[PDB]
Structure formats: structure tokens, C-alpha cells
Structure 1
Amino acid sequence: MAAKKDYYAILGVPRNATQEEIKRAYKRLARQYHPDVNKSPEAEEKFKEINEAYAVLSDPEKRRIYDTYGTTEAPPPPPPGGYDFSGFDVEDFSEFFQELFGPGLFGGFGRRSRKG
């Protein structure tokens, strides 16, 4: 329920956007925050968010995951390891991604207890 980042707002597309407008919405922003173009700590952070937004917005397959989940009440996500993230480095993205795909990225480390 880390409602601090609307993935659609980050790219500049509506909720029921077509994948056509989503992909070019990544491309436009990528060039602005690319380190060779713009080597600022103010850029690197947005460069995460646009790739984070597009990591979910790449397919309606992932868009529906964060749509049906993304609350505290939301059912437990699919078993760890069963996520595609190669060439994104999604473990470095923020809480809203780390609540959904993150438990699968880590696989549950620390050897911690849980409440129910």
C-alpha cells in the first residue's frame, strides 16, 4: 500500500493506457535521465522510477498484478524466483515494487518471524 508512486503518472499515461503510448513514455524520459546526457543524483532517482513504472507497465500481465494487489489486504504474491527482472535491477526500486515482486527477488532472507 506504498501509494507514493503512480506508475502511470511517472511515465505520463492514463490507467487504461495502450502499450504503444507506454513504451514511448519510457523512451522519452529515459533520454532525459540517462547518466551520459544528465549525470545528476537528481536524475539517477527518476531513472529508477521510469524503469520501475515500465517494469510493471511493459505488459497488462504485470499491470493487473499491481492493480489486484498493492494494498495491505492484497493476497500473498506468486512463489519467489518466479519473476522476470533481468536488465532492470528491480531489487533497487522502492517499497511499492518491493512489496509486490520484492519478496520474490529476495526469497525471504534474515530468518525472521511473522504475524498473522
Structure 2
Amino acid sequence: HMLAKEDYYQILGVPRNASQKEIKKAYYQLAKKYHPDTNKDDPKAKEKFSQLAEAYEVLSDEVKRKQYDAYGS
């Protein structure tokens, strides 16, 4: 009954070959989905919105993204 082990790639909606530039767009478009303007009927969306910045942080740098993939499954 545990949670699945997904990667930042999915949290941002970007491929495994995506670029630091393409991630910026996917990160922004996603944020608009979990924005506080749509939290009117989704008080949990705020928690998900944070996950975007968390994953985008690592995917924001090739080194961080690659390093994270090294310890991936």
C-alpha cells in the first residue's frame, strides 16, 4: 500500500531526453495547473504545486538531472 517510485521527468511531463530549456516551459505550464487560482475546490493542489519546483530543481541542471538518473531504477 505504498506510493509508486516515479521520476521527475513525469512530475514535469518531460521526456528522458528533454532539454533544460524544454523543462522550463513544461514547468511553467504545469504550475498554472496547480496554481492557487484553481485551489478554490482543491486545497490539496497546493501540495502538488510544490512537487513541480522540487523536480524542476534537479531537471533545471543537466548535472543534477543526470546525477539523479544515475541512482534511478
**Same fold per TM (> 0.5)?**
yes
Is structure 2 residue 5 aligned with structure 1 residue 4? yes
Distance in 2 between residues matched to 1:5 and 1:48, nearest whole Å: 16
| 3-state SS of 1:32 partner | coil
The alpha-carbon deviation at position 70 of structure 1 amounts to 4.5
Q: Structure 2 counterpart of 1:47, which letter?
A: F
Q: 5+ unaligned residues in a row in structure 1: which ranges?
A: 72-116
Deviation digits for residues 55-86 of structure 1 (CA, Å, limit 9, x no counterpart): 11001011022112247xxxxxxxxxxxxxxx
* Counterpart mapping for 1:55-66 below 5 A: 55-66=57-68
The alpha-carbon deviation at position 30 of structure 1 amounts to 0.8
Aligned-residue sequence identity (percent) comes to 61
How has the CA–CA distance of structure 1 residues 4 and 45 changed in structure 2, closer, same or farther, with 3 Å as cutoff?
farther
Q: How many residues of Structure 1 are paired with residues of Structure 2 in the alignment?
A: 69
Deviation digits for residues 31-65 of structure 1 (CA, Å, limit 9, x no counterpart): 12121x12223311220221111011001011022
Distance in 2 between residues matched to 1:32 and 1:48, nearest whole Å: 12
* Over 3 Å off, 4+ runs: none
Is structure 2 residue 43 aligned with structure 1 residue 41? yes
- TM-score between the two structures when normalised by the length of structure 2: 0.77
Q: Structure 1 counterpart of 2:34, which letter?
A: Y
Distance in 2 between residues matched to 1:70 and 1:25, nearest whole Å: 21
Please say which structure displays the higher CA radius of gyration: 1
